[PDB]
Enzyme design. Sequence first.
Site, PDB file in Angstrom:
ATOM      1  CD  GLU A  27      -2.725   1.266  -0.015  1.00 25.96           C
ATOM      2  OE1 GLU A  27      -3.324   0.255  -0.387  1.00 25.96           O
ATOM      3  OE2 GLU A  27      -2.808   2.362  -0.581  1.00 25.96           O
ATOM      4  CG  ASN A  31      -0.116   5.932  -1.320  1.00 28.95           C
ATOM      5  OD1 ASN A  31      -0.916   6.786  -1.415  1.00 28.95           O
ATOM      6  ND2 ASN A  31      -0.424   4.739  -0.913  1.00 28.95           N
ATOM      7  CG  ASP A  58       8.426   9.545  -3.309  1.00 29.36           C
ATOM      8  OD1 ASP A  58       8.589  10.633  -3.796  1.00 29.36           O
ATOM      9  OD2 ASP A  58       7.598   9.349  -2.439  1.00 29.36           O
ATOM     10  CB  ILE A  79      -2.408  12.200   3.203  1.00 32.87           C
ATOM     11  CG1 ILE A  79      -2.808  13.038   2.011  1.00 32.87           C
ATOM     12  CG2 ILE A  79      -1.868  10.881   2.740  1.00 32.87           C
ATOM     13  CD1 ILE A  79      -1.644  13.447   1.182  1.00 32.87           C
ATOM     14  CB  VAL A  82      -8.845  11.680   6.443  1.00 26.83           C
ATOM     15  CG1 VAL A  82     -10.129  11.614   5.656  1.00 26.83           C
ATOM     16  CG2 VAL A  82      -8.958  12.736   7.506  1.00 26.83           C
ATOM     17  N   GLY A  84      -6.819   0.373  -3.883  1.00 26.42           N
ATOM     18  CA  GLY A  84      -6.102   0.286  -2.614  1.00 26.42           C
ATOM     19  C   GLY A  84      -6.772   1.049  -1.483  1.00 26.42           C
ATOM     20  CB  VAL A  85      -6.943   0.216   2.087  1.00 24.77           C
ATOM     21  CG1 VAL A  85      -7.729  -1.019   1.763  1.00 24.77           C
ATOM     22  CG2 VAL A  85      -5.484  -0.101   2.307  1.00 24.77           C
ATOM     23  N   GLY A  86      -5.375   2.896   1.061  1.00 17.20           N
ATOM     24  CA  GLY A  86      -4.855   4.158   1.509  1.00 17.20           C
ATOM     25  C   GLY A  86      -3.862   4.022   2.627  1.00 17.20           C
ATOM     26  CB  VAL A  87      -0.729   5.862   3.324  1.00 15.53           C
ATOM     27  CG1 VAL A  87      -1.180   7.283   3.469  1.00 15.53           C
ATOM     28  CG2 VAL A  87       0.452   5.593   4.197  1.00 15.53           C
TER      29      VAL A  87
HETATM   30  O1  NPO Z   1       1.601   8.889   0.626  1.00 10.18           O
HETATM   31  N1  NPO Z   1       2.356   8.129   1.223  1.00 10.18           N
HETATM   32  O2  NPO Z   1       2.033   7.519   2.226  1.00 10.18           O
HETATM   33  C1  NPO Z   1       3.722   7.939   0.700  1.00 10.18           C
HETATM   34  C2  NPO Z   1       4.105   8.631  -0.428  1.00 10.18           C
HETATM   35  C3  NPO Z   1       5.399   8.480  -0.893  1.00 10.18           C
HETATM   36  C4  NPO Z   1       6.290   7.643  -0.227  1.00 10.18           C
HETATM   37  O3  NPO Z   1       7.578   7.516  -0.662  1.00 10.18           O
HETATM   38  C5  NPO Z   1       5.873   6.941   0.897  1.00 10.18           C
HETATM   39  C6  NPO Z   1       4.582   7.088   1.368  1.00 10.18           C
END
Ligand code: NPO
EC number: 5.6.2.2
Lengths: 188, 185
Positions: A27, A31, A58, A79, A82, A84-87
């Site tokens: 996940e 991102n 990244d 982000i 609050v 794929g399911v999301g970070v």
């Molecule tokens: O949005 N995110 O959680 C991220 C975005 C970029 C990354 O390299 C790692 C996590």
Amino acid sequence: LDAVRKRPGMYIGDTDDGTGLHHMVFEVVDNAIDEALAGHCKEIIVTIHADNSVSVQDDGRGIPTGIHPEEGVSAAEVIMTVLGVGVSVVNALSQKLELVIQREGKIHRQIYEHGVPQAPLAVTGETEKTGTMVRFWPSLETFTNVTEFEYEILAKRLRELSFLNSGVSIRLRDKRDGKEDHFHYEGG
Amino acid sequence: LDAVRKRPGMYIGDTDDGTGLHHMVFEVVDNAIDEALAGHCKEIIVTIHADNSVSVQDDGRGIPTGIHPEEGVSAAEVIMTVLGVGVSVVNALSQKLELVIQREGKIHRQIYEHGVPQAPLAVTGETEKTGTMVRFWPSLETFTNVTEFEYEILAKRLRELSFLNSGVSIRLRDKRDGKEDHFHY
Ligand SMILES: O=[N+]([O-])c1ccc(O)cc1
Ligand SMILES: Nc1nc2ccccc2[nH]1
Ligand SMILES: O=[N+]([O-])c1ccc(O)cc1
């Protein structure tokens, strides 16, 4: 985040057979790929640390850091907290998560514990680089039975991903034993 | 509850000097007193356990257990998880919270950890008694320095409450050393 905490399996998958655990990494990687794709050099580095945490970084533009006008906290925190399911699911299910964002000449840092920010996102220094780095320690309260990352599971997936994401350099490093791999595909 | 976890001090009071810690008990006691007033016997018992957890119980009717039409979970869970500040704050800042409700001939139990229900409120047996009991173990991730309850701090406030809530009997027990009091105006 309480909905996720209430029934983690519904969001991350099986928390006992290792599939959900590795899903946490994937996940974050998804991102990261998105971030890397929006820049020129496109490099992601996934590191399995000796303390069984994983970092994903990244070299993209850095996720937004300005205060969200409605939420009242930085965009990054929105982000992370609050939904794929999301970070945010990953954050929720991690006992610790460290966030570092390099953007606009500034280094921004934040720490979370079980998805709870320990302080607001803070500018702690200057930088010549750009990018986002997230390092997380999966919650041992959630993940049972299988609690350590399997290099092979990550390598295989990253390799597959490299072909789908042409131009993106993906490095995998395992600090437990020194193993390293580099997946980079051209195509386009 | 994330708002509470993020800034515990703003909801419960200073988390390092003992203020907040003791406030946790008082928040629960407020609910307990309300329940006791609505019942026949009118007694609450506050116990400081050996492991530095505190339980508060009343012999009242028992807090509501039925499903909340809008929230979709038991009314008790709504009380424990939805934002004096309320016991949801206490739940949020407790590494563990045990809830037991005796109502309408049934015993109901539920456990929370850091405000998160481990399972839905469940009927575990029958009983003729009525009342509510909550035992909580303050999170040591949140409460620092002063992490052990002070009997006198609790006793002082309970004494004040006894005068104000005249018909209610309030017992304080300390299992660490056997100390106890009974405040009844
Ligand atoms: O949005 N995110 O959680 C991220 C975005 C970029 C990354 O390299 C790692 C996590
Ligand atoms: N240890 C621990 N587990 C937690 C779960 C949710 C919020 C805070 C927490 N601290
Ligand atoms: O609502 N509550 O949290 C309560 C209610 C009654 C009681 O005896 C203890 C706690």
